[PDB]
Amino acid sequence: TSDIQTYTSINKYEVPPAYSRLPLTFDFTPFNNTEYSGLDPDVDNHYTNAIIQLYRFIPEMFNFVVGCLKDTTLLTDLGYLFDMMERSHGKICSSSNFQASLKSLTSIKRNMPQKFNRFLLSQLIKEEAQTVNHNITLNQCFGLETEIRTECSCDHYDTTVKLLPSLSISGINQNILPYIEYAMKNVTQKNSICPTCGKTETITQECTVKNLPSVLSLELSLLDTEFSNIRSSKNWLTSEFYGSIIKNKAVLRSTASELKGTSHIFKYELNGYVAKITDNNNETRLVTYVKKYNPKENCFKWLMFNDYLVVEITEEEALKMTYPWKTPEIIIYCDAEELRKPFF
């Protein structure tokens, strides 16, 4: 017999109590002894709660969103929500209102967490645009400047530059750094019909991310076979790394000095991630790992959120990818200095 907040087991195949499917939702205090609020799972699309928690713990993000309340829209709803979650004392909060706003805009399936992540960021960034203020903060925080050049025979496929708020990660050909590097610079081929010519042709496209934004939001979009190689790789989920734009390419390394012939080096730290838990029943759910700075003790602590259960955990557990019941879904890296700023 174990307390529900027990978050390890001996055998890697047994889902520990803290990760289990919690009772339907009335006291939740036995599930949470922290000062951080969990979310009521009795809402539509309750898997979005894991992603709401994730963003709630990005300082640049929290602070900007709650700041808007001092100026209707699911930005401001997210504002009210974040604010309730901070000042509530670990008391449960509801994403009810936020869910409503989302709906108005008319089992965890493959890609749905990633799809919701892209939608949410894009939607927040667009609303941020709707203020005649400027009012760029989210755009500049998450914005990946992505250039697509096309080698083609017909001279049409004009180069495009779009600002994307997240980076989609697919397989390469071990740790996470080369995956991110590949997503930020790659050359691919595909069959295509030219919108201008109508010619069908194999085109070659070079996709280049131009900048290293202060928040990198990663959507893992891998095959389950690729996930099996991730679990076998110890230390796949790198906790911190250094990046630089070197010769029009993003280069990412574990240490700063591995970065050569570049004049500006940026440090990133893992802030949090959302993971899918798969039960023995094959029942499925999202949890959230986050890292929060305690500037008095000059250290970070790691928290795991499972709906309304919240438990402080070791960094070892927080970075462990080897559990067959665990799959990373969405990962956030954050400028190391930003990560230490206070939540207002």
Ligand SMILES: [Zn+2]
């Ligand atoms: Zn053409």
